């Protein structure tokens, strides 16, 4: 449970990274050039063959190997803090399993993305005869996913109501848990994420007539219920009002694509500002977020070079 032990290893791993020259040089290359350069880089350790499925699988495997080891090799409160960094994949896998069970599709069709829980647990959870049994199979000592599944289990059985309440409660519970530990940077990143998620949900539900309070999330500090209601009800100048907050560059934008790009840039900057705590969790956050951005950019450039999309449609996605 010593952050120094984890942080030295994370410093070595972050030293094993791909430079911006790799992203710029592949930005005008064919799928075979992207394949050959990828194979020569450390990202091409497990690159088996050629083709977009191969590129995607290789990216997934390399990311799992070099970012999924974080919750292990560290215990105690160090583990309890570093576990609330890589939890979105677990949230997605649980949501996918819940939806598949609700509809009726086989449990062997889901993707089962590499997360923080156990793959055997994920497989066995589908066969649970009750949602409580599925939660118990997915239950961990301190998993926010398990806590939120218990919380939503007090609302409904395996239905769309449970599916939505689970996501809302998991986001709120992750916010609370991050606030419940004394890590300077984790609380800030979690709060900024909560605010960004609330704003993005308001933009996504634009004009849907839904109750802003019922769709709102709590935990952030760069938005409020009034601003959520304004943005949801179409007042696209509320995003112009939130100036001064860390998400201040998003003033005057009214499109979903531009809003997503802006929020991604802001969150990436905030996570890259965590490198100021070399003996805290901050270097771990920086390594995780930089790895995720590298994976996303690599997959986008490789898909562009494979399916022959034009250059101008992807260069704007490597802005940050």
């Amino acid at each position: 449970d010593d952050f120094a032990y984890l942080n030295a290893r994370v410093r070595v791993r972050r030293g094993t990274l791909l430079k911006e020259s790799f992203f710029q040089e592949a930005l005008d290359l064919s799928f075979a050039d992207f394949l050959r350069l990828l194979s020569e880089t450390v990202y091409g350790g497990e690159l088996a063959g050629q083709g977009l499925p191969d590129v995607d699988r290789a990216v997934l495997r390399t990311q799992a190997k070099l970012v999924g080891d974080l919750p292990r090799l560290v215990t105690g409160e160090a583990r309890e803090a570093v576990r609330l960094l890589l939890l979105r994949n677990d949230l997605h896998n649980l949501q996918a399993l819940l939806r598949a069970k609700a509809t009726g599709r086989p449990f062997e069709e889901v993707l089962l993305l590499p997360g923080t829980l156990r793959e055997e647990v994920w497989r066995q959870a589908y066969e649970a005869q009750d949602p409580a049994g599925m939660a118990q199979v997915l239950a961990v000592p301190g998993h926010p996913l398990a806590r939120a599944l218990r919380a939503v289990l007090r609302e409904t059985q395996d239905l769309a109501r449970v599916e939505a309440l689970l996501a809302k409660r998991f986001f709120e519970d992750v916010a609370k848990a991050a606030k419940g530990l004394d890590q300077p940077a984790l609380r800030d990143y979690l709060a900024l994420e909560v605010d960004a998620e609330n704003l993005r949900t308001a933009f996504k539900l634009q004009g849907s007539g839904l109750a802003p309070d019922a769709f709102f999330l709590k935990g952030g500090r760069f938005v409020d219920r009034v601003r959520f209601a304004r943005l949801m009800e179409g007042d696209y100048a509320v995003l112009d009002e939130l100036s001064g907050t860390p998400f201040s560059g998003l003033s005057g934008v009214r499109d979903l694509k531009a809003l997503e790009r802006g929020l991604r840039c802001v969150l990436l900057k905030e996570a890259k500002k965590g490198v100021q705590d070399p003996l805290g969790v901050g270097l771990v956050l920086a390594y995780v977020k930089e790895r995720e951005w590298e994976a996303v950019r690599l997959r986008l450039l490789a898909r562009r070079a494979y399916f022959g999309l034009p250059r101008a449609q992807v260069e704007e996605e490597v802005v940050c």
Binding site: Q129, R230, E233, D235
Partner: protein, 649 residues
């Protein structure tokens, strides 16, 4: 000890096997092995068998869900004596009635909640909308807002046409009763502007925000009026239906669970053309319980009750505790840790011997023991009533079986905890400080308080010596049993390690009793040298590089037994001091608030007992389960539980 068991091998006609399994399941125990890899078929169920399993599983699920909806428990009962079709035809009506009643209750309750959610706002809105409920140009729009900050919305209202649609709080003192009525959509634009400047729209869900104001309010009030009677009738009907159908539902649940278990078991058999076979394990003493059932097989099946495997590679063999009546009620205190491997020893009998005596040595207060006896009386009466001890505060669901076992344990504890108390005075605390029935050479009484514990300077050496002696006995027995088990299982390395540990401990103890104790080491020098030599020889001849540090740790585990003396002395001294202070305050001081002094002494003693009894009870078992069981193995290899076949309810 871990009961001996034998592999029953049996085979017969592929059709008769479906009833042979039923007979065995209705019989006693047999842990069925998977049996499939036997150079034969995996006995996969027929398509009609698979359909029968699905139907019975549906029956079980429906029975459980309907029982939960009615609120009844899932405890078993007498079986349901019906086929699949009859069981389905019985479960369907009850499920239908429960579903309908639950839907009706949800509807009535939700209607009541909705109507009461906006009663005063509805009254205020009905008051204000007395003349503009249905208008051609535009209709009045209500606004349920917070307290009278109505100027906040009036700012935007005055920015719009204030020449019409004035809004203010008229009634519904729970808040500001806002509403605006005007011609054209200028009122709607003003509503948007007031929303921007701070205002809310009173569009309640359903007919409240979707019907004409007055008629909708009247309908809401009528629903709120009529909902009580409907809710009462629904509740009465549901309760009566549950009371009528509980027994049938439980019977169906038991029958369904039994049948589904039988089918899923049938999926475990081995098979071939026209044939089925099994290879389950059964305890050697239980043989007539199987034999007196599987004798009447249709073909008079093989029923070859073949031997156990030896200790040689039989870690899959099931284990069960098999202890005499004296020791069984205490097996609860020992089952919570790892199960024995198969041929390794069972520590179950040691505990009833060595735990209660240690506890009695720990606590000696005669009055405290009498209090424990009274508490046991209460618990035993509750168990006698068969009503389970439910304590929701600590999440306690003590069933009568556990209550009885704990009562037996407590009685056997109280015996020694009173005997050792009377063997050391300290009655009711320190009652001898008011009347010395027990007494000693400082003020002689009716009987000798032998080995007085309060006087530290006298008996401390004796008590510490006795404690360390009992500890040496326990650790030596544990090491010996480890040696014997390592010899029996032909583990030469284990035998060497155990022998070396015992020899090294003997050598260290000899050198200790010579140097740190008395002089005259003539008869002990040879023993000390022998022990050290034995330790070295065993370490060399076993090559395990066994830690002399581990020998030291074993030595510490030996020495730790002084905790009994320590805890006992602390408890006795504290109780005696408290009783002395109480007696002084009551009689020696004032002598008219004797009631106050006795009450204070009682309260202090009760608080001390409540706050210390937990540790007092925990320490002996801690010593046992940390030292003896660790020495004798018994926290490795984990075993395999003896699950019998079926026979629920």
């Amino acid at each position: 000890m871990i009961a001996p068991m034998e592999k029953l091998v049996l085979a017969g006609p592929k059709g008769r096997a479906k009833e042979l399994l039923q007979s065995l399941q209705q019989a006693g125990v047999v842990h069925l092995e998977t049996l499939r890899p036997e150079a034969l078929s995996a006995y996969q169920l027929s398509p009609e068998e698979r359909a029968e399993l699905r139907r019975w599983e549906a029956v079980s699920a429906g029975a459980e869900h309907t029982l939960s909806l009615l609120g009844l428990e899932a405890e078993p009962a007498r079986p349901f004596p019906e086929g699949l079709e009859a069981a389905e035809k019985a479960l369907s009506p009850i499920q239908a009635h429960a579903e309908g009643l639950t839907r009706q209750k949800q509807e009535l309750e939700e209607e009541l909640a909705l109507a009461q959610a906006y009663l005063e706002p509805l009254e205020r809105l009905a008051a204000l909308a007395h003349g503009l409920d249905k208008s051609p140009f535009l209709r009045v729009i209500p606004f349920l807002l917070t307290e009278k900050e109505l100027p906040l919305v009036e700012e935007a209202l005055r920015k719009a046409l204030e020449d019409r649609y004035l809004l203010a709080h008229e009634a519904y003192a729970g808040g500001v009763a806002a509403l605006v009525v005007v011609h054209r959509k200028e009122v709607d634009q003003a509503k948007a502007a007031l929303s921007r400047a701070g205002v809310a729209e009173l569009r309640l869900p359903g007919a409240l925000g979707e019907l004409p104001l007055s008629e909708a309010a009247r309908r809401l009030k009528e629903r709120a009026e009529a909902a009580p009677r409907e809710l009462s009738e629904v509740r009465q009907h549901l309760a009566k239906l549950a009371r009528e159908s509980a027994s049938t539902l439980q019977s169906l649940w038991t029958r369904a669970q039994d049948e589904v278990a039988r089918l899923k078991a049938l999926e475990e058999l081995a098979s071939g053309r026209f044939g089925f076979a099994l290879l389950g394990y059964v305890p050697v003493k239980a043989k007539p319980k199987v034999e007196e059932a599987l004798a009447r097989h249709k073909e008079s099946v093989v029923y070859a009750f073949e031997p156990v495997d030896e200790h040689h590679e039989a870690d899959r063999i099931p284990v069960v505790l098999d202890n005499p009546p004296w020791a069984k009620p205490f097996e609860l205190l020992v089952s919570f840790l790892n199960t024995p491997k198969y041929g390794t020893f069972d520590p179950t009998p040691v505990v009833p011997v060595f735990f209660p005596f240690w506890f009695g040595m720990i606590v000696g207060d005669i009055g405290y023991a009498l209090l424990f006896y009274l508490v046991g009386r209460w618990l035993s009466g509750y168990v006698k009533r068969n009503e389970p001890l439910v304590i929701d505060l600590f999440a306690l669901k003590l069933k009568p079986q556990v209550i009885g076992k704990l009562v037996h344990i407590l009685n056997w504890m109280v015996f020694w905890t009173v005997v050792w108390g009377v063997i050391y005075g300290e009655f009711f605390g320190t009652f001898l400080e008011h009347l010395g029935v027990f007494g000693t050479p400082e003020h002689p009484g009716l009987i000798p308080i032998l080995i007085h514990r309060i006087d530290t300077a006298k008996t401390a050496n004796l008590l510490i010596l006795l404690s360390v002696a009992f500890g040496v006995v326990l650790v030596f027995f544990g090491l010996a049993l480890r040696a014997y088990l390592g010899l029996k299982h032909r583990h030469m390395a284990h035998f060497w390690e155990g022998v070396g540990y015992l020899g090294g401990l003997v050598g260290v103890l000899a050198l200790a009793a010579s140097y740190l104790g008395n002089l005259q080491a003539g008869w002990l020098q040879g023993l000390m040298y022998l022990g050290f030599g034995v330790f070295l020889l065993a370490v060399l001849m076993s090559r395990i590089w066994l830690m002399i540090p581990e020998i030291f740790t074993q030595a510490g585990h030996i020495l730790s037994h002084i905790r009994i003396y320590a805890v006992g002395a602390a408890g006795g001294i504290l109780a005696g001091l408290l009783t002395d202070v109480g007696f002084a305050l009551a009689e020696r001081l004032g002598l008219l608030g004797v009631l106050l002094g006795l009450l204070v002494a009682g309260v202090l003693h009760l608080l001390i007992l409540l706050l210390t009894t937990l540790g007092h009870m925990l320490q002996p078992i801690r010593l046992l389960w940390v030292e003896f069981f660790t020495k004798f193995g018994f926290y490795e290899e984990n075993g395999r539980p003896y699950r019998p076949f079926k026979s629920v309810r």
